[PDB]
Amino acid sequence: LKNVTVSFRETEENAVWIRIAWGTQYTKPNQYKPTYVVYYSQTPYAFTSSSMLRRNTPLLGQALTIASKHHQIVKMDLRSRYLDSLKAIVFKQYNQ
Amino acid sequence: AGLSHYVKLFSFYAKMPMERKALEMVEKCLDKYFQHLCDDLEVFAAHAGRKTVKPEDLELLMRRQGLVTDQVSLHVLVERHLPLEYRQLLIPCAYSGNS
Amino acid sequence: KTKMLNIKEYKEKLLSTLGEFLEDHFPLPSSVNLITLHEMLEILINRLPYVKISDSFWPPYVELLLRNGIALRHPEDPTRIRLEAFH
Amino acid sequence: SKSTRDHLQTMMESVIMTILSNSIKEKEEIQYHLNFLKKRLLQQCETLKMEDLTNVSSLLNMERARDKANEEGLALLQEEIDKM
Amino acid sequence: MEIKITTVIQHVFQNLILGSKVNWAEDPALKEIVLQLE
Amino acid sequence: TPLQKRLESVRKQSSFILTPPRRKIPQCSQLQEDVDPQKVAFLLHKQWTLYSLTPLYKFSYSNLKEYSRLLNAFIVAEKQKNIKVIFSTLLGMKGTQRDPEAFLVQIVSREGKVLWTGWFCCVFGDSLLETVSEDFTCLPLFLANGAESNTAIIGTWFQKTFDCYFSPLAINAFNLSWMAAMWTACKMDHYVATTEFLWSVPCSPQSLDISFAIHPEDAKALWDSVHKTPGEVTQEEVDLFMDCLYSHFHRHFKIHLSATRLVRVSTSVASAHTDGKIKILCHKYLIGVLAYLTELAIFQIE
Amino acid sequence: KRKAPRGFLKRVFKRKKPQLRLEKSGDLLVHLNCLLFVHRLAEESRTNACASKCRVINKEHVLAAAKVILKKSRG
Amino acid sequence: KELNIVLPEFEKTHLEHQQRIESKVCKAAIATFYVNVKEQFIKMLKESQMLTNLKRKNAKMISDIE
Amino acid sequence: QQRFSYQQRLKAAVHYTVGCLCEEVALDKEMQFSKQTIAAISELTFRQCENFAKDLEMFARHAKRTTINTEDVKLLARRSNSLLKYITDKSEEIAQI
Amino acid sequence: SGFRKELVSRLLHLHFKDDKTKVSGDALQLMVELLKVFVVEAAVRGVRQAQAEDALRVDVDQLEKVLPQLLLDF
DNA sequence: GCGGCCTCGGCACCGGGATTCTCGA
DNA sequence: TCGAGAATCCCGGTGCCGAGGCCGC
């Protein structure tokens, strides 16, 4: 995806807040509907804004799992609107 | 005063809410409008060779502003915007005593 | 039929006065006497028209029956006149 | 496509402008040729974009140059990736 | 089709003995023709 | 006869004498006469917000232009407090020949951007025709779909000029379950959408909603399990279909769905809500779905 | 607003330029000129607002309006 | 396709105008107008080539995606 | 016919002399005027020469006069400051002739 | 060179709505000047908005964007 | 701190992307 | 058998009316 505006923001909770504006080589990067990816820094779990689920989603996971030195990216199939609750669930951080 | 009259009339002429900061700049627009007009009436009345500014001295100017045409003459333009007691002074009515 | 004759005589009252009192107005310097100019407007509105004078002359007169509300200018092409549609 | 061929014949009329600038000595004769050009209108338009055509086509040609660059880059980096 | 002319010529008497130099009601002819009954 | 017949009807209705309406499965309603294919097809997949409309006094299906102007000049005046109003008789949205012909009210904005598209229909509503006098052209159903603001303006105009009153038709979960059952009993093919039942549990602090969406062919085979008498569906058959849903949901999630209330029953025939924004008309059964809807509107009027 | 100030336009025509002889109702013509100039301002500023799709007229639309209409209204 | 028939009609139109021509300078003006019409037909052929290049881009908008 | 032979012949004359002007002004800023560019600027000269003729006639009518003199075109030059300054010196050069 | 005398007589007199109005050679050569600077001004405004876009060609659209201030100004 | 004013936002109806599955290289 | 085109299931990304806030009397 040669024309993308990837903008990171290392938050203070130690979780890089990637934002990706997509666009193929034929088009300019589209900032109308970006795909924010909240990758917790050294965590195997990397939240993702389920914007459109295009052909970039298997490239979103692929780039995520190759940037962080992992090998397999799996959609957990956890899909919630409350990221502050997904953070609790996937980390078991809510009852502790 | 009169500039405040026109900015208030702007409200009922733009049919849409604006900002006061827009109004003091349209005040400079009216000030420059006169800064072009009163010396445009100056030069047009001098072009006619007359010291005073007769109504036809301004009809030519409004022809310059493209608002008087062969379709829209001077007097018809008075119909559409000026009130009756004011156009009674401008466009000649008839009583066998046309104004 | 009685209402027909009554309305007809009311018409010959109004129009007789339109001949008489309009000599208090009375024509002056083709122009077209305001009786004739008015009745040319009135004939046109009777069957519809928006032109009705195609800018009849003596401009003091054409704008006379415009300020009092007798006639109306065409809202788009203001060289043609209509008689305000009192119908 | 009526307005498009009206722009065609305005280019025709610009060329007419040019010839009349160069000719100017055939006034009745180019009256005749403007006559045959007007019935040429009546023969083509009656029977039957361009600035967007030319400009957008040049823009899209630069776009296809950019696309060939995209294929050069992506395909070659795919050759290197699958070479790995 | 005649009263519709009699409601047109009538209302151009309410608009001609108004806009002109009328001296409308200080006259005994017009006073019965002006104030035209509907 | 002119009123006392309606009083006796009110007596019969309030008596509540053994109601269970064994209803005929909505029969394939071959589009009667004209039924403008473009218009009706435009009117199908639109989410009509139902209302109950009392009979219109002094209405006539000849003076459509006069009402169109009278309402157009009223809507744009409510903007003073760009729009065209096209009253259009539908010519075929009627159950029997004696029903009043359904007519539309469309807020057409330049192009044909139909903002509101009202719809009054009276199909198989001969429980109201035989009780009201001739002066009233009764159309119990009113169909909105435009914004609620424009509906609450055209409704006011209709109250002002026709003495008709719009109660927002609310299909109770009982009637909702009924229609959810007779629509999976239909003889259709190529099911457009899954048979979804949007439940909504009555919890006081929270408002959990359930979408018990069944595969449309799978619900037809489940309906055939509880369908024994053909031609007409009974209240017990409807309740057994709904209880097979209950015993497939409480079986799975251990929460008694029967303790909840239906709020929306999407079906391949026609979606149907509760709060009013009810009738989507996916298939061309709309003379039967509208038959049920008008029969329900009589219940509210009468 | 249904007014046209007799005094204000005359005072402006005298303050700005001290040497003229504007006729009995010539200031009424000046008011008509300004009325139509502000008409053009209002309409072309509405066009400017739709150009940026701003639902309120602001400074950045009026300044663009001025350089078109004020220059156009020059004799 | 239709461009060849249009060019043939334009040449036939120029030939018919030359059949009714009156002078040698008028023939030169007609030849210049025919060259202008050839330029217009070249613009039409450039529009056809732009359609072909847009088809290539559509293939190029899928090959790159592939 | 006569309207066409009138305005097309002067469209030709305008294009011819304006093309001479195009070669005369293209040498300043090393520019080239394309065929449609010349065709446009010629017809704007034509269309706004209509405007100048509309203005200039009523300019003479304004001074209760039938002929067009230098003050009329000075009022035509009244429009813009930059060409007020340009036309002032070009007008004193007119008076030199 | 310029826009000559027998052509400036003819072009201006075409738009003349009456036959009895003439423009003198003293004013005629100045009319030559004012429309010559019509070409000069339209061309300089076009090439100025061209360097503003940094072009080596004056295209169709540049002239169309210069009319809203060309006809307004000139 | 209220009176007619205004501005976010849940719900919901209408507009393209990828999966079905039919047809051509 | 397979490759591009169309339609349509799945859920957006948008449109648009009540709720909350807010400034004279």
Author numbering:
A (entry chain N): 116 to 211
B (entry chain T): 458 to 556
C (entry chain K): 163 to 191, 205 to 223, 230 to 268
D (entry chain Q): 77 to 124, 130 to 165
E (entry chain H): 204 to 241
F (entry chain L): 25 to 105, 116 to 143, 152 to 344
G (entry chain W): 14 to 88
H (entry chain U): 249 to 314
Source paper text:
The CENP-A nucleosome (CENP-ANuc) is surrounded by a group of 16 proteins, the constitutive centromere-associated network (CCAN) and organized in various stable subcomplexes. Human CCAN is composed by five modules of CENP-C, CENP-LN, CENP-HIKM, CENP-OPQUR and CENP-TWSX. The arrangement of the four sub-complexes generates a b-shaped structure, in which CENP-OPQUR adopts an elongated shape to generate the arm, and CENP-LN, CENP-HIKM, and CENP-TWSX form the semi-circle. The CENP-LN sub-complex, located at the center of the ‘b’, functions as a node for coordination of the assembly of CCAN by contributing the contact sites, with the sub-complexes CENP-HIKM and CENP-OPQU on the opposite side.
Further classifications and reconstructions gave two maps with distinct features in an interior tunnel, representing the CCAN complex alone (apo-CCAN) and CCAN in complex with a fragment of DNA (CCAN-DNA). The built model was then docked into the EM map of CCAN–DNA complex at 3.7 Å and further refined. The structure of CCAN–DNA complex was built into the cryo-EM map at 3.7 Å resolution in which a DNA double helix about 25 bp in length is clearly resolved. Around the DNA is a positively charged channel composed by CENP-LN, CENP-HIKhead, CENP-TW, which is complement to the negative charge of DNA gyre. CCAN complex binds to double-strand DNA through the electrostatic interaction between a set of positively charged residues from several CCAN components and the negatively charged phosphate backbone of DNA, which supports the previous reports that functional kinetochore assembly is independent of DNA sequence. The duplex DNA is topologically entrapped by human CCAN. In our CCAN–DNA structure, CENP-LN coordinates to form a closed channel with positive charge to encompass a double-strand DNA which is similar to CENP-LN interaction with unwrapped DNA in yeast CCAN-CENP-ANuc. Compared to the structure of S. cerevisiae CCAN-CENP-ANuc complex, both human and yeast CCAN complex bind DNA at the same positively charged grooves assembled by the coordination of CENP-LN sub-complex. However, human CENP-LN has a narrower opening, probably caused by the shorter CENP-NCter which leads to the formation of a more compact conformation of the human CCAN complex further strengthened by the interaction with CENP-M. Therefore, human CCAN adopts a close ‘b’ shaped conformation to grip double strand DNA, while yeast CCAN forms a more open structure to accommodate CENP-ANuc.
